[PDB]
Design a protein around this ligand. Sequence first.
Ligand code: M6I
Ligand code: M6I
Lengths: 304, 304
Amino acid sequence: SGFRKMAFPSGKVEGCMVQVTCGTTTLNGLWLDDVVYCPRHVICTSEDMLNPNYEDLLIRKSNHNFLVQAGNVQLRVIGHSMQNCVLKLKVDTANPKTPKYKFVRIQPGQTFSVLACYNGSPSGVYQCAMRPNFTIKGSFLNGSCGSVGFNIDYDCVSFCYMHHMELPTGVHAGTDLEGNFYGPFVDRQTAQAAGTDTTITVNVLAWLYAAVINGDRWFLNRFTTTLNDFNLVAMKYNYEPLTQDHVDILGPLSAQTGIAVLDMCASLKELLQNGMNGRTILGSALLEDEFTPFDVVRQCSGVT
Amino acid sequence: SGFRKMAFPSGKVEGCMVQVTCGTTTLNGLWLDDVVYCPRHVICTSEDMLNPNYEDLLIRKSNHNFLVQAGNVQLRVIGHSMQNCVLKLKVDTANPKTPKYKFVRIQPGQTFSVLACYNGSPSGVYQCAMRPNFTIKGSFLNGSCGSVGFNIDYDCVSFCYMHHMELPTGVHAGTDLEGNFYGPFVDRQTAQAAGTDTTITVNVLAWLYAAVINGDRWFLNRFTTTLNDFNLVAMKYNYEPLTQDHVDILGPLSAQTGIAVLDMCASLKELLQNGMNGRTILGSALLEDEFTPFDVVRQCSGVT
Ligand SMILES: O=C(Nc1cccnc1)Nc1cccc(Cl)c1
Ligand SMILES: O=C(Nc1cccnc1)Nc1cccc(Cl)c1
């Protein structure tokens, strides 16, 4: 029992972190096989960041200008290429620590672990959700760029995120490992509108099932609701509309607890309309949305 | 910017996890050098757990009865010994993945990362605080015993905790790596009183400084207080009494923000007496106490 915001074990990802330097900028790279991936803004200077012409900035750079260091060993760069907002540096040595890996583009509302790094060295690991508006509320400082987000299925690391920037609002933006930004963001030092965010309804419901499994049941009530009635409440409280797909994904949790999904929706409806009344659920005084139904089943079953 | 409940990178600890089986019980062991450490209750059966005579149960066991598996390789056990509530299994092979390590007994209120494991395999990593009452509010299932808590200072892993049991209340109890329980707990299937817990005042204050550094300043006020006046409020709200040692430890955070420690104490006093008024601080609707001043400085400075 007990429920924590649990990150994946970061060992397989720590073995992939390197330092990338170009000119006066140093950030993190991910070394998989004979390729080092890093944000393309490593090639910029303070004069460039307002509206960099990346194609032009990269033309002034040669293989020898990209200094890649993995701990104490220097990697030899034999090729460089820009793919969207990421640079791919071909190196002459395949990473002996390369795990089984995939590059995936996660969907908004899905979760992942972030291994925050500075100068190619890991500082910490935390669990994140990709917000419905494609931002992440992380913990990153200048130098953390190139830190990656990932999920692990037994021995395969699915990399889903690479950190690129902090918006003027303090929220974070980045790309998939093909350099495609999540959201409307561009890698420029400019004010950029993050769209209206909503709460990930299916995750809140999954976390309410996690609460029930772990003994916190005060919020359960004698009511039920329909998808339509619930969705009017979700609309009013800036919650993502619930669909039958979401109900279907909550099936295992519904089967384990014996509480029908629409009955849990009626609990959530009462928590939205009345608040917590100074009470807590799994140590929280607000409705948590950064656990998916998959995360709940995995944590409550002990998947390694 | 941003503030997360950040765990240490778990790679150095994942390389130490093994599976320990004795009879019909399987749990986790920590393999450091040529020694495997695990909870001594691995030698019990369901008939024994109410009041095991560990000395007697261990006498019926030989080196060949302790099956230690590190992934796919079996380790050869050449010695066994009980030290307090831990078994030390001498193996003929030193762990090639042994990092620089220390065994430390942490103080209540200090934090650490837990690498939850099942059958010698890591499932996840999370940050914990040792409660003032020597319990930990973790996430552990049956089979998680032997999972360890640790801190990392550059390349040295200070192991501080090994998981032994879940109390009937759902909170967790365990030992240091010499087998000494934290708190009054004994490794028996019996109801055991956890003492009255309090909130870790110095940590809440450290987290209020983390909030200020990251832009959340609404709670700051025009008031100040004394250690004595604050301690009367702390007494009323079951907060640990604040001492000059705690104020001294908050010195760096006080210097960085320019907010005197007693001024931050007056903010905390108003939050205790008036609550949050439906507002949040660093994404939380309650006062967080699982970040030490050291954790705040480290996260806000980027120590790797
Ligand atoms: O945000 C940037 N760095 C940073 C700082 C703090 C936290 N995370 C990241 N650098 C940057 C500046 C302007 C545009 C771009 Cl793409 C990158
Ligand atoms: O608690 C025990 N296991 C467990 C289950 C769930 C979460 N954490 C641990 N086993 C045990 C039973 C009785 C006394 C002792 Cl020391 C150990």
